[PDB]
Amino acid sequence: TTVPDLESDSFHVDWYRTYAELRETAPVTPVRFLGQDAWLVTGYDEAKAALSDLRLSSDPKKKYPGVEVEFPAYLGFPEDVRNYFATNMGTSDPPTHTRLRKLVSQEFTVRRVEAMRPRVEQITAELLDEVGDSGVVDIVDRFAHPLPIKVICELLGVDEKYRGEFGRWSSEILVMDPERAEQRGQAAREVVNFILDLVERRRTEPGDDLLSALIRVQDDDDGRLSADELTSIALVLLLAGFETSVSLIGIGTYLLLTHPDQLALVRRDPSALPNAVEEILRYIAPPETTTRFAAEEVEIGGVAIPQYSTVLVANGAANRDPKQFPDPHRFDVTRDTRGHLSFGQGIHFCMGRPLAKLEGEVALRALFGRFPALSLGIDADDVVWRRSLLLRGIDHLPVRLDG
Ligand code: HEM
Numbered sequence: 001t002t003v004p005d006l007e008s009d010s011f012h013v014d015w016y017r018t019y020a021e022l023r024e025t026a027p028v029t030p031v032r033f034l035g036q037d038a039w040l041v042t043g044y045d046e047a048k049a050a051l052s053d054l055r056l057s058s059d060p061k062k063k064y065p066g067v068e069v070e071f072p073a074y075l076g077f078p079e080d081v082r083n084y085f086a087t088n089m090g091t092s093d094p095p096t097h098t099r100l101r102k103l104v105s106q107e108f109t110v111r112r113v114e115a116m117r118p119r120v121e122q123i124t125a126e127l128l129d130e131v132g133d134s135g136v137v138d139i140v141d142r143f144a145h146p147l148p149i150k151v152i153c154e155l156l157g158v159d160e161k162y163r164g165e166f167g168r169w170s171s172e173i174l175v176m177d178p179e180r181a182e183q184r185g186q187a188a189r190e191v192v193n194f195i196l197d198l199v200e201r202r203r204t205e206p207g208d209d210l211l212s213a214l215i216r217v218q219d220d221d222d223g224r225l226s227a228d229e230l231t232s233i234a235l236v237l238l239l240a241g242f243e244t245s246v247s248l249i250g251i252g253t254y255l256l257l258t259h260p261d262q263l264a265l266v267r268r269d270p271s272a273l274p275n276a277v278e279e280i281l282r283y284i285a286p287p288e289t290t291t292r293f294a295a296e297e298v299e300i301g302g303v304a305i306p307q308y309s310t311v312l313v314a315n316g317a318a319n320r321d322p323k324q325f326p327d328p329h330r331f332d333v334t335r336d337t338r339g340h341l342s343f344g345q346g347i348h349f350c351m352g353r354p355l356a357k358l359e360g361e362v363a364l365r366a367l368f369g370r371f372p373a374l375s376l377g378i379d380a381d382d383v384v385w386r387r388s389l390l391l392r393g394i395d396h397l398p399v400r401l402d403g
């Protein structure tokens with residue numbers, strides 16, 4: 001009877017209990033969000049099927065007779081701005097998707113990511129060197145945020161003097177508040193103008209960075225990245241390239257800090273960090289929901305999703321489905337996390353997984369290694385969770401360097 005409003009506090013306050021209640025009733029239920037009807041998928045089997053069903057399109061640019069396609073994530077976005085944000089792998093369906101992903105896969109490799117390991121370690125050490133030996137500091141502004149932003153900038157050839165503004169615009173983009181739709185759309189245009197210039201500079205002065213490489217990437221069959229494709233891929237790589245890791249590092253720091261046994265365990269055993277990263281992602285997936293558009297009627301979990309429906313796959317909620325992950329509310333750094341959906345599922349499976357695990361592992365290892373008595377600077381229940389279903393995270397986290 002009562003259709004859930006994804007804007008309500010129920011989805012930002014102890015929201016996993018809310019997901020649990022829904023999943024129990026119907027793993028595929030109708031919901032309201034940003035003034036339109038949608039379907040929320042909270043069951044694991046259902047979410048995995050949904051992401052595996054190509055009839056559920058990822059392309060917001062496709063047009064359908066009498067329909068006005070509206071992806072929640074592009075709230076306040078002019079059409080040209082949307083196109084700049086949506087002409088990449090994550091916003092494409094095969095065959096376009098296939099060639100774009102393959103072309104980008106030729107340069108965004110494990111080798112290139114591993115080559116960065118030394119940089120990630122040095123950047124991590126320099127940031128930690130600067131916070132001191134004691135007292136309180138905001139681990140986000142001083143570590144979780146600056147590390148990923150510097151790494152992605154180095155990967156995409158973004159000179160130092162051009163790194164002080166986009167962080168602000170990206171932040172605004174993560175929140176989908178109807179009240180600030182205009183400010184959100186304007187932050188998006190700034191990002192677009194920033195990318196257009198970056199591409200211009202890189203075309204004019206090539207380097208050994210990923211963007212320079214993508215500008216040259218080609219293949220007999222796949223062809224190459226068109227100007228629009230190159231610009232849009234660069235844009236997403238920039239944002240998705242750091243915001244996710246910022247969430248991972250912040251949430252991971254908070255989780256380990258608020259779970260004595262898990263904290264104590266990690267401090268005693270190092271080789272437990274890698275799986276901890278996986279469990280941190282399973283427990284509180286940054287990309288809580290991922291959007292899809294039903295190009296045809298699609299039945300998921302026995303529910304007929306009508307054609308033209310907006311579908312929100314609750315990746316995060318799927319990771320807490322007790323049917324897939326027993327005692328889903330227990331943060332256990334030793335649990336077998338195989339199968340979680342925090343990196344997606346299917347053809348759109350995260351392309352940056354290698355880099356994310358590298359950053360998370362290097363960051364958490366260094367932080368908890370450098371400060372053995374690190375502790376939260378506030379009560380666990382007082383942490384402020386970013387109000388976003390697009391990318392969950394923590395934007396301010398006080399910590400006591402010496403306990
Ligand atoms: C912990 C960090 C990360 C998480 C949790 C994460 C998660 C995800 C998820 C859920 C998807 C699937 C989206 C969908 O199904 O529509 C995805 C796709 C993707 N991710 Fe990540 N990601 C992370 C880091 C990265 C990084 C560091 C980069 C860039 C350097 C990146 C680039 C991409 C790209 C380009 C895709 C598009 C895949 C495609 O459509 O073929 N990711 N990511």
Ligand SMILES: CC[C@H]1OC(=O)[C@H](C)[C@@H](O)[C@H](C)[C@@H](O)[C@@H](C)C[C@@H](C)C(=O)[C@H](C)[C@@H](O)[C@H]1C
Pocket residue numbers: 073074085088089090091173236239240243244287290390391
């Ligand atoms: C504002 C809308 C966009 O969001 C962002 O770029 C966010 C900053 C990123 O954190 C998102 C959440 C990523 O981490 C991945 C899950 C998906 C990504 C790779 C896509 O391709 C996807 C089309 C995406 O660009 C849009 C949803």
